[PDB]
Amino acid sequence: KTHEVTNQTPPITGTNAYLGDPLLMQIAARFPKELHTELEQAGRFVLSAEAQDLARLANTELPKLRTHDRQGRRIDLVEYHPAYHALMRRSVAQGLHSSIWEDNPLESGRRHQARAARFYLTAQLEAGHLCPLTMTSASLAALMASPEVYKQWSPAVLSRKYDFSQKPAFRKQGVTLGMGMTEKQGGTDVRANATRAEPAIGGAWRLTGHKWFMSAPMSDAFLTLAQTKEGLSCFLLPRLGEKGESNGFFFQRLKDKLGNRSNASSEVEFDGALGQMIGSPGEGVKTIMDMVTLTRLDCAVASAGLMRSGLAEAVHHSRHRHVFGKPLVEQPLMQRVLADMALDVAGATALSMRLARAFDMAASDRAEAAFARSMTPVVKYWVCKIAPALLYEAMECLGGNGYIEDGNLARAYREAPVNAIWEGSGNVMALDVARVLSRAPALFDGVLDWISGQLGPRGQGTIDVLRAALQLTETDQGVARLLTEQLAFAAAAAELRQLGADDIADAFIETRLGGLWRTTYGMLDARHNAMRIIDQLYPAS
Amino acid sequence: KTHEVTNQTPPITGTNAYLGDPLLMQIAARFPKELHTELEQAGRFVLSAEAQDLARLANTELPKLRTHDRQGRRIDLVEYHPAYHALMRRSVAQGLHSSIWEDNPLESGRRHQARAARFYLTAQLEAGHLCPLTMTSASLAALMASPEVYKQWSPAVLSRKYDFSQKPAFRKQGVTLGMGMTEKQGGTDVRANATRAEPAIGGAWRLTGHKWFMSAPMSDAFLTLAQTKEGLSCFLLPRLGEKGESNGFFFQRLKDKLGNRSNASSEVEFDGALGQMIGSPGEGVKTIMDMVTLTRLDCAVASAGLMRSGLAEAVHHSRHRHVFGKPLVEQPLMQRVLADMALDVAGATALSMRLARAFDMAASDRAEAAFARSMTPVVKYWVCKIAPALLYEAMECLGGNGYIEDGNLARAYREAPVNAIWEGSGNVMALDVARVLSRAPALFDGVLDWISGQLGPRGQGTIDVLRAALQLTETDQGVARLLTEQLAFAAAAAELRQLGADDIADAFIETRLGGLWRTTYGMLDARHNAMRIIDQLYPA
Numbered sequence A: 001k002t003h004e005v006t007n008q009t010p011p012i013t014g015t016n017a018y019l020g021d022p023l024l025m026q027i028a029a030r031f032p033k034e035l036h037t038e039l040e041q042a043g044r045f046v047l048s049a050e051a052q053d054l055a056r057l058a059n060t061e062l063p064k065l066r067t068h069d070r071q072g073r074r075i076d077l078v079e080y081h082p083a084y085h086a087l088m089r090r091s092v093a094q095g096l097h098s099s100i101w102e103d104n105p106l107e108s109g110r111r112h113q114a115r116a117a118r119f120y121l122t123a124q125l126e127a128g129h130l131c132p133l134t135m136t137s138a139s140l141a142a143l144m145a146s147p148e149v150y151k152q153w154s155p156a157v158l159s160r161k162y163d164f165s166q167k168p169a170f171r172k173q174g175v176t177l178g179m180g181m182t183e184k185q186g187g188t189d190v191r192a193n194a195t196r197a198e199p200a201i202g203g204a205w206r207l208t209g210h211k212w213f214m215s216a217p218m219s220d221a222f223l224t225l226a227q228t229k230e231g232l233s234c235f236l237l238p239r240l241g242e243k244g245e246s247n248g249f250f251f252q253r254l255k256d257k258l259g260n261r262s263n264a265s266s267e268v269e270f271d272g273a274l275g276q277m278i279g280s281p282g283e284g285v286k287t288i289m290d291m292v293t294l295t296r297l298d299c300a301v302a303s304a305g306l307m308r309s310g311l312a313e314a315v316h317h318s319r320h321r322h323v324f325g326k327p328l329v330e331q332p333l334m335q336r337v338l339a340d341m342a343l344d345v346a347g348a349t350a351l352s353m354r355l356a357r358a359f360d361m362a363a364s365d366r367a368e369a370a371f372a373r374s375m376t377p378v379v380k381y382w383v384c385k386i387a388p389a390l391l392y393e394a395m396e397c398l399g400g401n402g403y404i405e406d407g408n409l410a411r412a413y414r415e416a417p418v419n420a421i422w423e424g425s426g427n428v429m430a431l432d433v434a435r436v437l438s439r440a441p442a443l444f445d446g447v448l449d450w451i452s453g454q455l456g457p458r459g460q461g462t463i464d465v466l467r468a469a470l471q472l473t474e475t476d477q478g479v480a481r482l483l484t485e486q487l488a489f490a491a492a493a494a495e496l497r498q499l500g501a502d503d504i505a506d507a508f509i510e511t512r513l514g515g516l517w518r519t520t521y522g523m524l525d526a527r528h529n530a531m532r533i534i535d536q537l538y539p540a541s
Numbered sequence B: 001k002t003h004e005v006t007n008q009t010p011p012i013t014g015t016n017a018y019l020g021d022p023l024l025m026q027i028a029a030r031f032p033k034e035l036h037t038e039l040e041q042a043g044r045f046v047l048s049a050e051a052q053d054l055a056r057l058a059n060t061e062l063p064k065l066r067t068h069d070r071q072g073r074r075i076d077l078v079e080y081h082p083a084y085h086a087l088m089r090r091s092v093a094q095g096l097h098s099s100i101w102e103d104n105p106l107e108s109g110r111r112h113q114a115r116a117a118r119f120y121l122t123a124q125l126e127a128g129h130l131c132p133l134t135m136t137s138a139s140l141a142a143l144m145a146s147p148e149v150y151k152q153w154s155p156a157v158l159s160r161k162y163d164f165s166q167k168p169a170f171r172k173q174g175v176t177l178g179m180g181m182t183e184k185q186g187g188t189d190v191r192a193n194a195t196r197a198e199p200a201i202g203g204a205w206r207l208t209g210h211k212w213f214m215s216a217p218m219s220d221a222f223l224t225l226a227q228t229k230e231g232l233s234c235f236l237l238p239r240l241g242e243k244g245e246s247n248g249f250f251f252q253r254l255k256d257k258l259g260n261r262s263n264a265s266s267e268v269e270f271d272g273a274l275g276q277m278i279g280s281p282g283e284g285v286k287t288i289m290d291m292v293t294l295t296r297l298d299c300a301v302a303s304a305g306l307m308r309s310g311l312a313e314a315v316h317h318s319r320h321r322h323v324f325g326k327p328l329v330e331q332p333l334m335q336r337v338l339a340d341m342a343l344d345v346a347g348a349t350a351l352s353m354r355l356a357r358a359f360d361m362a363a364s365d366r367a368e369a370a371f372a373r374s375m376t377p378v379v380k381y382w383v384c385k386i387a388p389a390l391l392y393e394a395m396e397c398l399g400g401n402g403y404i405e406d407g408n409l410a411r412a413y414r415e416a417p418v419n420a421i422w423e424g425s426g427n428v429m430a431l432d433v434a435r436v437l438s439r440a441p442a443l444f445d446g447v448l449d450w451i452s453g454q455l456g457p458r459g460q461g462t463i464d465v466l467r468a469a470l471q472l473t474e475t476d477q478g479v480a481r482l483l484t485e486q487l488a489f490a491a492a493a494a495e496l497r498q499l500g501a502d503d504i505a506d507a508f509i510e511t512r513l514g515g516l517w518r519t520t521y522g523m524l525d526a527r528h529n530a531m532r533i534i535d536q537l538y539p540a
């Protein structure tokens, strides 16, 4: 041999991602014991060596579109690696697509939070297959606009048996649902959709057009927007007909994507595809409003989990990798970088779960409903859009191996932009935040009141900043991103206080609410012990 | 047809990346006429459809390691797509590996700046093949430590004829040089290297060990660190022997990289590889100090070019893509986001080229030499490390297509971290700054005087901030990144004043030096006039 291999970091595999995360455990502290037991088992699974192999395979053995069979007939099939189906099977059995719609007494009053904690853990393992599960869970809220259609589909949708066979949906053990919104001329401006729907025999509708981005193409049906005589309408469009034949779907290509690669995203064209209208004619936008809101929470929770998993690897690496004779984690500068990132990961996780809590409490508490209506785009804006910069710095903490695809940080870095881009990007979230202030000032008083209650009298200066930003946004729409980010900082700070993470909150408040312009991590002085921040959030395991 | 395809952005291909960049033209305003002509031709090349096809192919048709031939002999060859060799050929013919060492009277007093302007443009086209050119240009500063080896190798190294054949080095039309430094147990702590060098017949040395990341493996020789009885020493190690036979290189694998994929990076093991010592025994670290410094300017210049190119695409898209009946560039919020990114790209470009100017003036100006020694890690820290976050936001400005690999932003986003990581990352740059503060505080006094002269009396508040940061860093090594980033902000602001970009400087100073903690772009109010910033830096 020419050399020895020394000073290598042992893998994080085999430990428990839930029990290694005290902030998450505090977030779940009031869950019933049965949920704690399930989260510990989930925490063990997502760091197991077998699960990590499935995640690597799903993202390297990529889905393939087969437009035709060997004799020249169209079949419009997308084939996946078995690893994809194994992840789907377990997450569907776990109810990640269905549990908020189920009647489970152990989760009463906690359905969004219980699911969000599971979602957060799974996103640390493999994020791509979460897309069909997010769309399936959220799609049922659109189906509520037509209760007969909900009653018809929900038994099949809520089934916890995953079924990827090419049977018609009504013969499958369970079904999944997708979304056909974006067209080539725009995904934001859905009223510019040119897909058209025309009445057909039997009260159905026939659709002709295209959708430029349709993820999870082997879903059994798709919520789709199309124009009718009275405006943009929403439809439930099955991929297959009752005998299993194609329903006018023509897949053109799969996207060659930066990340999210385990999840096939197709370009599709429709020729006479038959479907049911969902909601009132011309009310397509209103019909899908609650569906989109549900996907935005998932985008935040998953981005937070992505950041958590990437930073845990950086902290763990620092504890074992020696440089100049001692572990990297004993270097003051590495301590400041790791602790500074931990503050944002902590704030993003607390805020994302606080939004889930507002969803659970909205029906019984007007102030929580106010938070739920107005802050979903704030949380999606900030949590998702900080992930690329933070995951890059976490990757840099690994040195050269961090840049190599046989690890996890490269894949997570490639993944991070998708949650921010996939549905409403930053500018769309921020304008949404400003519109709600223009139409419902009372909602932001309620949020400001919750923030002020948690920060206490010392936080009144932050409240004044937020009011000034709200008022300035009415003067100038261009400052809507400033308003959105400041709201997120303040709400994350408030929740860290609510959770009792007072050392974390102190340092978070001093920097994000009191510090100066910065562009890189590590902007902490010695006033707060950095090693304590790191040990509190990433205890050595 | 089922639908019409409408509201699409016309391609930016076919225009001129140099003439479309007023800040760059201002930076080059005093270059001789012949240099202006050459930059205009390069500006057209990097946006031409032909060149763009080469850049795409070089990054999708990946190099393959061939350890053996089909009969089972070791050959240790790496094969590239012809597009890689075409980019190398043109860049070598342009002297990107050699021009600072040439005696070109047209570039007298400007060698580093003239090369940096070319580098900036080429990085907008294809960054991966720049790695061997950066290493080759920088390697000559180390070879100077042994002047007889410099005389022996420099005609071949400085040749503008690219030659990728498998001939021995002195039978080729020109040669390139790489770097064998990082080992599995560490790339930062090179004194923990375990590769060993032993005396051989004829005054040569035999090396046995491994290098964990060796880019451009078909380079003709590599500057390599290995242990001798006196400590860590530097060696020039040819890949092939005098007859074209293997010189004890055993390539194991190529890295499967996030980005930079046109540039092969190998894992290699050395078994009795014959080389020449460069510099004194045990002085390997000192010998490669200037070589490393040169590569650090290149990292900054290229990262600035990456950012410039990605933001130019986002601005161009906004001018053509309609949403809600008007161009995106007419939406106030999109204007704030684009302008806010433009301020960092302008500051990073100005600061990087200002470092190049310090390199040109160092031999004749003590204040400029002080700037070059103390601020090289500052520029590399800030310019390279802001690129990932900025290129993500630029990608988001394109919408869903931004995330797709048939465009350019996804590749640039994957490229962006490599300049920060490839040689000394942020923590290493910041500790470099802290060491210079500890061992030679007067160098930063000179930097502050230069900043103060450019900012004018209005800037005393920024000087006081920098003094406080210097004092605090002497107290606490842990705040070294704060000192480093504040120095970059202030020097970027000062250089924008030096360039006469006073509207850009005004807006940059008020935000980066006077604003609040932020994590995303778009933090400008109406006083900064976002549309004028965009039109001044990215004219349609």
Ligand SMILES: Cc1cc2nc3c(=O)[nH]c(=O)nc-3n(C[C@H](O)[C@H](O)[C@H](O)COP(=O)(O)OP(=O)(O)OC[C@H]3O[C@@H](n4cnc5c(N)ncnc54)[C@H](O)[C@@H]3O)c2cc1C
Binding pocket: A178, A179, A180, A181, A182, A183, A184, A185, A186, A187, A188, A189, A211, A213, A214, A215, A216, A257, A260, A265, A418, A421, A422, A423, A424, A425, A426, A427, A428, A431, B321, B323, B324, B328, B331, B333, B334, B396, B397, B398, B399, B400, B401, B403
């Ligand atoms: C991996 C992936 C999967 C996806 N899956 C699906 C799917 O299953 N179904 C589906 O229908 N779509 C899907 N999408 C598409 C996605 O929803 C769209 O890209 C998104 O809606 C934006 O639409 P666009 O690309 O047309 O951008 P545009 O509408 O052209 O917007 C471009 C940019 O301008 C900004 N902008 C927009 N409006 C304004 C304004 N008023 N003022 C200022 N700035 C503005 C946007 O925020 C964005 O940054 C997916 C996207 C990705 C990347």
Ligand SMILES: Cc1cc2nc3c(=O)[nH]c(=O)nc-3n(C[C@H](O)[C@H](O)[C@H](O)COP(=O)(O)OP(=O)(O)OC[C@H]3O[C@@H](n4cnc5c(N)ncnc54)[C@H](O)[C@@H]3O)c2cc1C
Binding pocket: A321, A323, A324, A328, A331, A333, A334, A396, A397, A398, A399, A400, A401, A403, B178, B179, B180, B181, B182, B183, B184, B185, B186, B187, B188, B189, B211, B213, B214, B215, B216, B257, B260, B265, B418, B421, B422, B423, B424, B425, B426, B427, B428, B431
């Ligand atoms: C694409 C690519 C190409 C490369 N090509 C080459 C090449 O051709 N030749 C070559 O020899 N190398 C090459 N490298 C290797 C590269 O130079 C090393 O990754 C780098 O030197 C860091 O070494 P490391 O991975 O061992 O990290 P480590 O030395 O283990 O450090 C890991 C992390 O700790 C930080 N750190 C280190 N010391 C300290 C400290 N004292 N205090 C605080 N933080 C600290 C680092 O900044 C980094 O964040 C390449 C790397 C990449 C990504």
Ligand SMILES: C[As](C)(=O)[O-]
Binding pocket: A152, A153, A156, A169, A170, A171, A175
């Ligand atoms: C609504 As069904 C899948 O049971 O036909």
Ligand SMILES: C[As](C)(=O)[O-]
Binding pocket: A022, A023, A026, A499, A500, A501, A502, A504, A536, A537
């Ligand atoms: C960060 As804590 C409140 O779980 O110690």
Ligand SMILES: C[As](C)(=O)[O-]
Binding pocket: B022, B023, B026, B499, B500, B501, B502, B503, B504, B536, B537
């Ligand atoms: C961007 As300018 C140097 O023309 O002000």
